[PDB]
Design an enzyme around this catalytic site. Sequence first.
Site, short mmCIF file in Angstrom:
data_model
loop_
_atom_site.label_atom_id
_atom_site.label_comp_id
_atom_site.label_asym_id
_atom_site.label_seq_id
_atom_site.Cartn_x
_atom_site.Cartn_y
_atom_site.Cartn_z
N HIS A 117 2.07 -2.49 -8.39
CA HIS A 117 2.57 -2.28 -7.02
C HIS A 117 2.16 -3.44 -6.11
O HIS A 117 2.99 -3.98 -5.38
CB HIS A 117 2.02 -0.91 -6.53
CG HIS A 117 2.23 -0.62 -5.07
ND1 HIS A 117 3.12 0.33 -4.61
CD2 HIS A 117 1.62 -1.11 -3.97
CE1 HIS A 117 3.04 0.40 -3.29
NE2 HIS A 117 2.14 -0.46 -2.87
N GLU A 118 0.90 -3.82 -6.16
CA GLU A 118 0.46 -4.93 -5.33
C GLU A 118 1.25 -6.21 -5.60
O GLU A 118 1.63 -6.89 -4.66
CB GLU A 118 -1.04 -5.21 -5.51
CG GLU A 118 -1.94 -4.08 -5.00
CD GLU A 118 -1.60 -3.72 -3.61
OE1 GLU A 118 -1.62 -4.58 -2.71
OE2 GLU A 118 -1.26 -2.53 -3.33
N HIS B 73 4.45 -6.49 -3.83
CA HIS B 73 4.29 -7.09 -2.50
C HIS B 73 4.14 -8.62 -2.58
O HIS B 73 4.74 -9.34 -1.80
CB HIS B 73 3.06 -6.53 -1.77
CG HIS B 73 3.13 -5.08 -1.40
ND1 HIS B 73 4.21 -4.49 -0.80
CD2 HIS B 73 2.18 -4.13 -1.50
CE1 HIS B 73 3.92 -3.22 -0.56
NE2 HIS B 73 2.69 -2.97 -0.96
N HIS C 16 7.53 -1.43 0.89
CA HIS C 16 7.59 -0.08 0.35
C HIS C 16 8.99 0.45 0.28
O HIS C 16 9.87 0.04 1.04
CB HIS C 16 6.69 0.83 1.17
CG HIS C 16 5.25 0.51 0.97
ND1 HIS C 16 4.30 0.57 1.97
CD2 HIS C 16 4.59 0.05 -0.12
CE1 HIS C 16 3.13 0.19 1.49
NE2 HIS C 16 3.28 -0.14 0.22
C1 E41 Z 1 0.08 5.73 3.54
C2 E41 Z 1 0.43 4.46 2.74
C3 E41 Z 1 1.57 3.65 3.38
C4 E41 Z 1 -0.79 3.56 2.60
C5 E41 Z 1 -0.58 2.58 1.44
N1 E41 Z 1 -1.74 1.70 1.23
C6 E41 Z 1 -1.62 0.25 1.40
C7 E41 Z 1 -0.66 -0.39 0.40
O1 E41 Z 1 0.54 -0.02 0.28
N2 E41 Z 1 -1.12 -1.41 -0.29
O2 E41 Z 1 -0.17 -2.03 -1.10
C8 E41 Z 1 -1.20 -0.12 2.83
C9 E41 Z 1 -2.29 0.26 3.86
C10 E41 Z 1 -0.86 -1.60 3.01
S1 E41 Z 1 -2.87 2.20 0.08
O3 E41 Z 1 -4.02 1.31 0.18
O4 E41 Z 1 -3.04 3.63 0.28
C11 E41 Z 1 -2.16 1.97 -1.53
C12 E41 Z 1 -2.44 0.78 -2.21
C13 E41 Z 1 -1.86 0.55 -3.45
C14 E41 Z 1 -1.02 1.52 -4.02
C15 E41 Z 1 -0.44 1.33 -5.29
C16 E41 Z 1 0.40 2.30 -5.85
C17 E41 Z 1 0.65 3.49 -5.17
C18 E41 Z 1 0.11 3.72 -3.90
C19 E41 Z 1 -0.77 2.74 -3.32
C20 E41 Z 1 -1.35 2.97 -2.06
ZN ZN Z 2 1.76 -1.08 -0.93
#
Ligand code: E41
Ligand code: ZN
Lengths: 166, 166, 166, 166
Positions: free
Chosen positions: C119-120, C123, C129
Amino acid sequence: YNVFPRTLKWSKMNLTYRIVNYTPDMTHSEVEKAFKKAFKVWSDVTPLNFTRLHDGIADIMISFGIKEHGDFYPFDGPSGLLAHAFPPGPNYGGDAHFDDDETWTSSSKGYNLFLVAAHEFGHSLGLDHSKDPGALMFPIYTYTGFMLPDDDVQGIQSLYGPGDED
Amino acid sequence: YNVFPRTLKWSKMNLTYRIVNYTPDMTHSEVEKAFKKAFKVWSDVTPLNFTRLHDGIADIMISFGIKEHGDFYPFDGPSGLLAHAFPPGPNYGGDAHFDDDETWTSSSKGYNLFLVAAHEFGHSLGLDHSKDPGALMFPIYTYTGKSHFMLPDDDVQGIQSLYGPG
Amino acid sequence: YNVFPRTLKWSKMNLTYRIVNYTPDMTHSEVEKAFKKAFKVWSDVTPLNFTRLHDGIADIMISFGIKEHGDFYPFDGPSGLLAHAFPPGPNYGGDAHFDDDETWTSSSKGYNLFLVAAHEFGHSLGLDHSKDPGALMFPIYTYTGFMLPDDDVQGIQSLYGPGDED
Amino acid sequence: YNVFPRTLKWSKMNLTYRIVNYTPDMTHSEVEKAFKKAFKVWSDVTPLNFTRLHDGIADIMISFGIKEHGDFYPFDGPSGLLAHAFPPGPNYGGDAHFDDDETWTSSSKGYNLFLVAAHEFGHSLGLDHSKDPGALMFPIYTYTGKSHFMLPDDDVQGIQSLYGPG
Ligand SMILES: CC(C)CCN([C@@H](C(=O)NO)C(C)C)S(=O)(=O)c1ccc2ccccc2c1
Ligand SMILES: [Zn+2]
Ligand SMILES: CC(C)CCN([C@@H](C(=O)NO)C(C)C)S(=O)(=O)c1ccc2ccccc2c1
Ligand SMILES: CC(C)CCN([C@@H](C(=O)NO)C(C)C)S(=O)(=O)c1ccc2ccccc2c1
Ligand SMILES: CC(C)CCN([C@@H](C(=O)NO)C(C)C)S(=O)(=O)c1ccc2ccccc2c1
Ligand SMILES: [Ca+2]
Ligand SMILES: [Ca+2]
Ligand SMILES: [Ca+2]
Ligand SMILES: [Ca+2]
Ligand SMILES: [Ca+2]
Ligand SMILES: [Ca+2]
Ligand SMILES: [Ca+2]
Ligand SMILES: [Ca+2]
Ligand SMILES: [Ca+2]
Ligand SMILES: [Ca+2]
Ligand SMILES: [Ca+2]
Ligand SMILES: [Ca+2]
Ligand SMILES: [Ca+2]
Ligand SMILES: [Ca+2]
Ligand SMILES: [Zn+2]
Ligand SMILES: [Zn+2]
Ligand SMILES: [Zn+2]
Ligand SMILES: [Zn+2]
Ligand SMILES: [Zn+2]
Ligand SMILES: [Zn+2]
Ligand SMILES: [Zn+2]
């Protein structure tokens, strides 16, 4: 061996400063005069000496900026935070930042750069805020149209001594 | 008035550390052994003891990083700055950061992590640099080639001036 | 002349990554395998190629850190924020940061590094997303014990094309 | 899915700018004249118009800074990086930053602010670098010695491809 000092202070008496950039609000000469006078407040009551560098890395790097400007203390637009400075130390230590969303002056209007800078350089040299409402290091701005109050004299001399008492 | 007082030593003898992350250059067990030995240099000659935590906040937080890594004291790529550590105190106090643009080693191919860390932890405990060129706290890196390290007398005297003998 | 591109994307197909540091939670080999597989997710459906650098400046700099780690997006201790990555661009562009206050795994426990990294790196390559709850780029973590969903295939190919469709 | 779409041009023809701070190297009036002339390069050949604001937010925020200055794209001391600007869009979009570890000049002793700023504002408006070595948007600095500047045809064609002729 050496243990660390007991306070954050400069371990040398010859300090340098650099005016990295300038406010729109005042001429270059007026800014220079304000900062020179603000350093003199402190050198007049200690053995410290201040020299201006035009380039390169000085101990005390002075800049004007807005909002995010390269540290953990972003400015906040007009009013509110006015300026901040770091205690003695390497790198950003000693450095003084002024919020250019304020209006800086050589008058009773806006914020007088000399007076605010004199307070900031107290931080640059190792003073935190004072509870004496008459002190320069009391963190509420009042314009005066200058004699360093005794609380600030006592504080700065506790770190550096008095220099020539004449 | 107020100054910025420094914490001259830890006021407890039982300190914790945490290895927050790991260099690519050595195995986990090699890094753990280097840091354990580096703390032992100091605990062997004082009443200090060190305990490793795996999670949460520890007194001495240890990390590897490059360039700007969260404290506005950026590292500088290979060579130059190797590592820095904060003196005793809360929050970043005690913490040690290692520049991972250096090559860290258990031997001599690069900078020996154990030796550099032992110096860093001297700062974490309250020692500044020594002027004795044979001291661990002397800020030039050398390597003896020997499998055993003996803490020099200058460093023993410095750390015991703060904490006493073990 | 050249006007800018219409999306944030890499203008070259040969991209590099560097694992700057490593989590305590997994062996070096396991971390490397996770990131290699996570890049392969994307290279299998585009013309992109990923090569690992051990040192120096790579396009995609990968690191593990906690709290403040050198950008405007400090981590927050256990839970909450897990990781973040910057869209294609110079300097921090492309870079991926993982919160080491989480427990990273090669299993169904904690957070599976492969899945989160895949996922990262979406980006890092220019995907934001998705609203498709089945997509890899849907920002809610679910463990799967891997086939890149079609929404992510369509998104990444909109930027880079399909590469060899075999 | 979503990508990160770029704003290919400003969707209004009337843009504002603000000179947030000033270089030590030139007078205020010299800096103002340089930036006014740099905008005029582009407004003379398109329907764009530029208005200076003294306070608050403007589309194109212009500042001088050194090293890390608030965007994690740090400058690098004398030489190397001179300046950078963000493409059209909200917030930092359009903004231009000049490295004050360079010497900025109204003439030839250092880097001519007008010429460098005119290039920067090309980026602020939506132009990337040209491959034509005679273009303003070519990323090697040269100085003709002449008192008059003529916008090269390549740049005229590029900016008019976005905004049309004036
Ligand atoms: C509430 C949401 C938008 C916050 C997302 N989060 C962050 C995110 O999308 N990082 O890629 C956002 C704050 C930039 S997270 O840290 O919870 C996260 C990180 C990696 C992920 C990888 C796979 C699946 C979920 C994930 C969720
Ligand atoms: Zn993300
Ligand atoms: C509420 C207080 C603590 C906030 C102080 N302020 C900051 C200060 O003491 N800077 O030195 C504080 C947030 C670090 S302030 O920006 O309002 C300020 C700045 C310079 C000054 C100079 C002379 C007099 C007052 C001043 C007040
Ligand atoms: C010019 C000198 C003072 C800069 C010292 N350096 C730093 C230091 O003393 N860190 O503890 C200083 C910039 C705070 S260094 O990075 O070169 C360094 C670091 C660890 C060392 C460990 C053992 C021996 C030498 C070392 C040199
Ligand atoms: C290696 C090259 C692409 C780096 C360009 N440089 C930057 C640039 O193109 N800024 O607009 C690049 C790193 C984003 S530069 O700082 O050397 C520069 C800046 C303004 C200029 C204005 C006129 C002519 C040359 C210039 C070169
Ligand atoms: Ca004196
Ligand atoms: Ca303010
Ligand atoms: Ca400084
Ligand atoms: Ca102002
Ligand atoms: Ca280094
Ligand atoms: Ca600590
Ligand atoms: Ca390394
Ligand atoms: Ca492929
Ligand atoms: Ca977290
Ligand atoms: Ca990058
Ligand atoms: Ca972890
Ligand atoms: Ca430069
Ligand atoms: Ca803007
Ligand atoms: Ca300059
Ligand atoms: Zn600041
Ligand atoms: Zn203050
Ligand atoms: Zn650090
Ligand atoms: Zn040291
Ligand atoms: Zn980050
Ligand atoms: Zn910038
Ligand atoms: Zn350019």
